[PDB]
């Protein structure tokens, strides 16, 4: 009856918002391209507070964190490439032959032995030097004259070889007065009201692994194998499936490579591919045919929940596009693999040893956003072999169903890890009536 | 006892959450947010630092122009206009949560913030007129 306004400072109420999210990382110390040394050390006690009775609305497809990580990663690469060697003198006419012929017909042109004139430390004196280049990095002229793949579109820079491409777990954190909300629902769709909710000062460790088709080294579901898309009934919206069991994939570039330093100027050094010690073999990836068949069936079972227990779905290989999107392209040991994937999506399923993936290698990779910039990955010495799990996929429907892979948008990778998070802002001020009066 | 943690009583009743206000009060400025390098992570952190102190003082400023400086629970002289919410006390403090309460009182939140502002400008004018003897 006698009710006055009563002010409360520190009430558990929040609203959705967008904010700058800073990074955290664990102590490990060279320097990676992700600059995780320049982040605040993560707490050895990642405090997670459970929000009893709370139910929040989530929407991983309007989430702002993925739009910020997609830009942070790109800013991390541009920052790390700035002080490295510009390779504009390499955009010069190349005299190329095949390296060590007589193996398997049109697989000796897969990599070339190329010699060219080049600037020295003295601006007036030239040098004829030779290097090995993969076929995916050169084009003809129309004689045995070639040129770098990028010289008509982009300028080129080689990554400083002291920088590591190895992904390091990154923790995104909300500033003081903000919050991260986790959806602890073990069968969460990515959108809609989530029953179990917890708040965290920082997200879990997220390795910024940029892969195609197959999601690598990612986080796993705890039950079933979820499938996430905004409009699944729309064939133009990518399907982000996520396994609960990790299907292991082994990759290797078996050629024992040599890095030969070349002085292209005062203090400027281009790292050419010298020669190959031992056999000239084929880069490839293995994945257990048993586990892949099992895990490919789990996706079929959950794909039925959106298309019917009676319908038939089929897996086919990519339908074209740029090379990065038609193949399982990723980074392994510093070299950029581009793996033909037809041996993984060549299967039709009824209503009710290992397989090997032939991979080619590129060195002059282009930026995925703008045009006019491309990086030269320096050649890695020794033998390369990386071992990782496939934890998800990026599929595409066509409208008997058929599903094929793809997905050249980097933020689809971050969606697969930031789906369970949401950024809100604390509003600790609250007014409410009670029979209390000042003085 | 209980100690639900930071925002732990977000789903609790308004009266129960009104007993754990220091939990959310101390976490409005600390967190984890020593040189200032202007890198992609450095400019990021510097913004996260300045934004936190800004929003903290905006609340403390309103808490000041209402006579509630350094209070978690202050009472005022502004009476409750029933057009804000005709709900009874026992169906608010033992029923609703602070989230849904802010959802329905959000319209008149700017009206209430003005009534408290002049009630404090007039209370301190009366306190001066009383100590003038």
């Amino acid at each position, epitope marked *: 009856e006698n009710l006055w306004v009563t002010v409360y400072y520190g009430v558990p109420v929040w609203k959705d918002a967008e904010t700058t999210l800073f990074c955290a990382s664990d102590a490990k110390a060279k320097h990676n391209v992700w600059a995780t040394h320049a982040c605040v050390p993560t707490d050895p006690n990642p405090q997670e507070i459970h929000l009893e*009775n709370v139910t929040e609305e989530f929407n991983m497809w309007k989430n702002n964190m993925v739009e910020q990580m997609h830009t942070d990663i790109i800013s991390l690469w541009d920052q790390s490439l700035k002080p490295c060697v510009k390779l504009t003198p390499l955009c010069v006419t190349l005299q190329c032959t095949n390296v060590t012929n007589a193996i398997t017909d049109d697989m000796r042109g897969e990599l070339k032995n190329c010699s060219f004139n080049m600037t020295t430390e003295l601006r007036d004196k030239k040098q004829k030097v030779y290097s090995l280049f993969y076929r995916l990095d050169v084009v003809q002229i129309n004689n045995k004259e070639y040129r770098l793949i990028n010289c008509n579109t982009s300028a080129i820079t080689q990554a400083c070889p002291k920088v590591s491409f190895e992904p390091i777990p990154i923790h995104y954190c909300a500033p003081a007065g903000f919050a991260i909300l986790k959806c602890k629902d073990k069968k969460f769709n990515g959108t809609g009201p989530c029953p179990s909710v917890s708040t965290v000062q920082c997200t879990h460790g997220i390795k910024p692994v940029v892969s195609t088709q197959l999601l690598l080294n990612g986080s796993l579901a705890e039950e079933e194998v979820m499938i996430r898309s905004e409009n699944i009934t729309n064939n133009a919206k990518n399907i982000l499936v996520q396994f609960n069991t990790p299907v292991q994939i082994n990759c290797t570039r078996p050629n024992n490579n040599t890095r030969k330093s070349i002085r292209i100027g005062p203090g400027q050094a281009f790292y050419a591919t010298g020669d190959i010690i031992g056999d000239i073999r084929q880069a490839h990836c293995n994945v257990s045919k048993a586990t892949w068949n099992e895990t490919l069936g789990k996706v079929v079972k959950q794909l039925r929940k959106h298309f019917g227990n009676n319908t038939i779905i089929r897996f086919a290989n990519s339908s074209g596009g740029d090379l990065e999107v038609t193949t399982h392209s990723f980074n392994c040991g510093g070299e950029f693999f581009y793996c033909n994937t037809s041996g993984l999506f060549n299967s039709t399923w009824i209503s009710n040893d290992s397989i090997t993936l032939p991979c080619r290698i590129k060195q002059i990779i282009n930026m995925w956003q703008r045009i006019g910039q491309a990086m030269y990955a320096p050649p890695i010495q020794g033998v390369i072999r990386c071992v990782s799990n496939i934890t998800g996929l990026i599929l595409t429907r066509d409208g008997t169903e058929t599903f094929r892979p793809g997905g050249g948008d980097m933020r689809d990778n971050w969606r697969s890890e930031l789906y369970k998070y949401k950024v809100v802002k604390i509003e600790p001020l609250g007014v409410a009536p009670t029979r209390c009066k000042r003085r | 006892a209980v100690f639900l943690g930071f925002l732990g009583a977000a789903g609790s009743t308004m009266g129960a959450a009104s007993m754990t206000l220091t939990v959310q009060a101390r976490n409005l400025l600390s967190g984890i947010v020593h040189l200032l390098k202007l890198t992609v992570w450095g400019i990021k952190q510097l913004q996260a630092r300045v934004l936190a102190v800004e929003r903290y003082l905006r609340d403390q400023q309103l808490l000041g122009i209402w006579g509630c400086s350094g209070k978690l629970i202050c009472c005022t002289n502004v009476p409750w206009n029933s057009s804000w919410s005709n709900r009874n006390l026992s169906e608010i403090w*033992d029923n609703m949560t602070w989230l849904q309460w802010d959802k329905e009182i959000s319209n008149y939140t700017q009206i209430i913030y003005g009534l408290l502002e002049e009630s404090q400008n007039q209370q301190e004018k009366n306190e001066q007129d009383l100590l003038a003897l």
Partner: nanobody
Amino acid sequence: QGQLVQSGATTTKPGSSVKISCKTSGYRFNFYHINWIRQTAGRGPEWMGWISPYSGDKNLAPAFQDRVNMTTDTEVPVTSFTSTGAAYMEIRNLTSDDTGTYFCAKGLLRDGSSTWLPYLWGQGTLLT
């Protein structure tokens, strides 16, 4: 708001055991108890008992102590404050003297001295 749709009004004969359903909407099913009330024709209205859709803790009158099974399943979130739930009612050593209209009613408040009080009722169901 709040709605509590009840089951059908079908009838059986003594010795049996029937199940009464109560489906809720427009409110958080877990935040209030679920009561079962009986309006017999040859007796004053009787409170049978309430149950917690959150804590699972049930409490019945000693007249129904070992003759009634009360169960509720978990809710389905619709919005941040709206869910859908269900409550079930059973009788064991049943006769024809337990005839009347049966209601389901949710609790009043979430805390205090009148937490479980039957505040929002269903349309009732006719029995044998």
